[PDB]
Amino acid sequence: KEVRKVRIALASPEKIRSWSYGEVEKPETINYRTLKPERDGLFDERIFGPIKDYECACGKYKRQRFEGKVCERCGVEVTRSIVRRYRMGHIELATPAAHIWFVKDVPSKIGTLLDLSATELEQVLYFNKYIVLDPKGAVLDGVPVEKRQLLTDEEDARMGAEAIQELLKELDLEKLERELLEEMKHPSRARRAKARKRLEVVRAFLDSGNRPEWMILEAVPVLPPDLRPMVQVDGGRFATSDLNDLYRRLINRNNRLKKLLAQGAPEIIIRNEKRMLQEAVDAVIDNGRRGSPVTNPGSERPLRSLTDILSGKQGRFRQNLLGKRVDYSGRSVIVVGPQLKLHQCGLPKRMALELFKPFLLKKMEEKAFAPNVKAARRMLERQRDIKDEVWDALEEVIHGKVVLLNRAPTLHRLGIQAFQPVLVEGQSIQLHPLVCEAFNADFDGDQMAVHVPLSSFAQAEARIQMLSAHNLLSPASGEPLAKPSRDIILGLYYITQVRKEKKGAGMAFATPEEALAAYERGEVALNAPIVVAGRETSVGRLKFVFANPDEALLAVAHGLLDLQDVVTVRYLGRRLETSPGRILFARIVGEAVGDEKVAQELIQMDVPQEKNSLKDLVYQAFLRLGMEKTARLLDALKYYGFTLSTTSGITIGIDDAVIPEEKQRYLEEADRKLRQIEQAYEMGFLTDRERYDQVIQLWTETTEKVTQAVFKNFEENYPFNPLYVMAQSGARGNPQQIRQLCGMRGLMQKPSGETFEVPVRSSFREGLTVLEYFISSHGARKGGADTALRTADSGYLTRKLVDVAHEIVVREADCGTTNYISVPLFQMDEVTRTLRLRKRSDIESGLYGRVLAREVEALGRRLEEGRYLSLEDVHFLIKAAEAGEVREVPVRSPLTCQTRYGVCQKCYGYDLSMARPVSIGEAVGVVAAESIGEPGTQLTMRTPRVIELFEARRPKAKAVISEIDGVVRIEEGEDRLSVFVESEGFSKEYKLPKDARLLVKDGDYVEAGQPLTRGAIDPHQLLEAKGPEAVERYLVDEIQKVYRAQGVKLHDKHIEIVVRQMLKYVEVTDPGDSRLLEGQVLEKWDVEALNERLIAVPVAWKPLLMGVTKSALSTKSWLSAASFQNTTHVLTEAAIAGKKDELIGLKENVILGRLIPAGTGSDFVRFTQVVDQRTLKAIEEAR
């Protein structure tokens, strides 16, 4: 059949003897004096004891066997375990045991009535009195009370852990009651918490079998694995494995007990010799509480027992999910060079012989070359250096067949992609430059995992979506990526920075005077006005829109037009002033795509420069192109983008950054103000502290002035000469990076926290005073330990993001939801009570192609409801926002949809990539992680706030807020500067300490009460005194502030689709027929219990609030969860009860082996597409 759902939970002790049957016992000897393998005990091959001469009877047929001595046609030689499972039995029959029972009071305390001491009896050190015969001391009992001697005071009676098995049926018959008389404990508060947990644990045993077999009475390990043979190589030898020795402390103990018990063995001797047996159980399960090192009493390495290794932390769960081991790929260095811009790649011309060897062998079989496939495996091994004909047949195989190039580490969706292998020379694997901006890494010897897809159904599934010429142009986040990265920008920026070299201001009677005279000396081709224009009258480039401006590029080639934009009149489409330099740009993009008609109305002219706008040109072009042509651009801007800079050259000489000749005296006035604040001390004025910050602000301002003077000196005169600005404006330079070199930047702060006294005498050209560098280093330390510390905690937080949003996939078609969200067009500023334009940078990416909740009327045409408001509509609303017609643009966010198992159709406006609506199959659940999967490295963990709200952890100072909206009420005293809020009702007492105690008045819903300036009280209180109204929005607004501080491109619903997961769980109150009054049912699934039953029972609920890590421990499935930091409690709660895993889930399929429910394997794309015309015609009658 076909794999589908999955089942688990506990298994009765009788079921344990089912899978294992028998074959066990005997010591755990891993060898003998001779015959290292067999041992007839530990890992003995089932029915293999030297020469059993049997067992082969169970097998029907297939082959012969029974060879008397040595071995027959058994598994030992072949099929031995075959990596398959092989349970033993470990026999066992002692008093009792324990399956760890986790550390969340499971299988005990909850189903019983004892804590912090439930182990005292489970470890054979107490007495769980489970009998009634009327005591004496203080009446009888029914639980633990006989702590030694007590149980003998009367001399049933159970002092061992064996009682755990006795409370099986005793709790089973009372189970029905444990669900009735237990729930009988109505409110009363306090204890109404235990009754909830006790009912959840007993709710499992309430149905679907599952008995309290927690009291293990016979374990069953594994033998096939652990057994590593001799491993020489290099300089070493010997070998072995675990799981065996650490297991020897279980069977042997069970046997020795069978030898002691059988003979004369008094109580005391058995009680301790038994507790060690269960200890061995937990020992084989998980080593904790005390541990069990090797070579006792000496301490060394902790024995590996599932914990952290296998079924636990990174060891056999983190490595098997994704970080497996590809059996078809390789690694190499990185290189760059004009290949063809996308559509191609590098990849060696030697190793490729192995990656594409398979099909390559079959090709030669028919191409005369190799006589057979086998022979083709012995012509390329001894490095005979073929380099003959084979390199040709290899091309046929590498024709239209793409390859997947990966980058480590990985970040966002832009971390893989695919190209077409174009074997070059050597071994270095090169790629296109632009692609680097997606991996974030400088070429310095880095590698790239080169994966290769085999199946042809994987090739088309790749080159059609993973091709760099598709899923790279317009990435997620918000802004484009394929845009011309660094370098390229400077290749077109070096020709549009004006040529005004200052010539003066003469005048001619229509070019008959200062035309020839000035051509001799003074006044060249800069200013000077005549008739109307200026010096533009000199080289009139005629031509036309026939074959580009001839006279233009023609004169430039010769010793005429200096190019580099020297101001010249062309003819193009009209008498302009654009220089032949810009003409080139428009000519490059012209022939590239098709006719300048598009680039003409797109490319600007008023403010050319080619600054940080190259991302808008290509972006705006997509609307009139669409990959096919778009790709051509990034290719045209390539060739010229580098050649122009090559056949020109621009070096960074030590003088290239001319020192501000008008700076020296500036420091004089700044230093002349030093004594000013210094002599104030000798006169006893202004506290030493006031003096401190007084001088700080001084240099904090002058620095900006000096930077301004420099940036200015580098603006007017010295245009193209200064490269430090050519990249600072828009290419590959930082503005604050300039004030460092020619500047003087020295406002460094002490290592702890206190800006030093005197700054730093930067001016690199002049070596520091040997003290300046040591002083500036104190601050240049946090700028490296923080970025590197982005793998300590922050790096282990992104996982939490990918776990939460997982089963979120865009499917179905038109769900139909009323309630909608109204995105704010204007935000407030804590500083001053006044809304701002939100800087536009937030509104744009916040409404980029959405779903207008309702008709939008705003001067002119209306924006129909459900209309995909592209970038155009956005600008139309922003520019019309200043007018005063719109304040809250209506829209539909993923936060409004009755579907927790699936995303939503057409609701997630635009698939932010192909410039169109999302496609059914786009796992936004993973894309949402790709959005946040980038800023991580660009943060400051050394304080952390983004995760604070996620886990809903109460922020610093709690930031107390008004839970209710009363009135003013502002009373002050001595130390009780607390503020209250009430109105004709009850008054709460907010012990407001001493800090942000503002006035304010007229009550307040929540706001902040004044003290909570930022990071309002944990969402717990919000939703508690508000609901899923502010919770779902407060995050999308606050959380982004941490991103807006660094100007992030991502935004939109990428972060608005992950919130619905943390707010899709509800509680229970007076349920209908459904058990558990407490409960913790999910959203949609709960709506079902109130949808079908609505045609009858009231099933009210309350919008609960869970963190980000909590949305994993308790989910609709189990395969997920764990990981984080609790791969122990998960499998517990997950077990016991039925808790049947769902089906629709990326992981569920990847792990189990099923196909992806998303991608091309979605339930919306599994039909037929084969019909060569006549096929449909034939079947038409064949039916």
């Binding site: 470890q123 050190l125 030694r148 005391i268 009680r271 301790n272 507790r275 060690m276 200890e279 005390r290």
Partner: peptide, 18 residues
Amino acid sequence: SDPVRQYLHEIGQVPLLT
């Protein structure tokens, strides 16, 4: 701190022989 103490307290609680 090992479980041997639990037995060490039960083994050293009863007197030997005269």
